[PDB]
Amino acid sequence: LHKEPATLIKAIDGDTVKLMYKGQPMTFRLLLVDTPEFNEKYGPEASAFTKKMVENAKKIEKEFDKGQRTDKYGRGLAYIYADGKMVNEALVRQGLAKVAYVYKGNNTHEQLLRKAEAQAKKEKLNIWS
Numbered sequence: 467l468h469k470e471p472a473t474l475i476k477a478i479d480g481d482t483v484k485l486m487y488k489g490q491p492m493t494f495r496l497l498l499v500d501t502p503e504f505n506e507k508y509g510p511e512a513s514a515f516t517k518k519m520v521e522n523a524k525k526i527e528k529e530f531d532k533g534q535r536t537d538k539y540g541r542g543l544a545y546i547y548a549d550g551k552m553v554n555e556a557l558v559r560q561g562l563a564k565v566a567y568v569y570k571g572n573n574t575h576e577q578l579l580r581k582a583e584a585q586a587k588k589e590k591l592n593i594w595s
């Protein structure tokens with residue numbers, strides 16, 4: 467896979483952000499993760515983490531996987547990087563998302579994210595507390 471430029475319109479919640487992609491405003495859903503909804507436990511924290519991570523970055527990039535690039539709701543599906551650091555991975559490592567929605571052919575970073583999740587579990591962080 468490779469990174470390509472992304473243009474942030476605004477953060478939405480733990481695992482969605484609004485990008486301008488080819489001049490279209492689109493919701494993008496982070497691959498391989500699930501954060502709580504905003505009004506569930508750790509939901510405000512996951513939202514705040516993703517929001518600061520993407521807003522405070524000099525640069526965000528996106529990386530499509532090999533399969534579907536949009537879901538059945540018309541959301542973009544990508545890994546998102548902020549100054550080179552994967553948001554999807556950082557959420558799982560901090561126990562603010564579970565690894566989830568793992569579909570064959572869009573699962574390149576599965577093992578990387580499972581490694582982070584196991585460490586968040588070992589440390590009993592957030593969701594795993």
Ligand SMILES: Cc1cn([C@H]2C[C@H](OP(=O)(O)O)[C@@H](COP(=O)(O)O)O2)c(=O)[nH]c1=O
Pocket residue numbers: 495496497498499500537538543567569
């Ligand atoms: C992350 C992801 C979610 N989805 C779908 C699965 C769920 O559909 P169903 O709604 O039919 O249960 C939904 C979860 O999104 P959210 O976790 O954003 O609510 O989005 C995909 O189709 N592909 C994906 O890669």
Ligand SMILES: [Ca+2]
Pocket residue numbers: 481500501502503
């Ligand atoms: Ca979610």
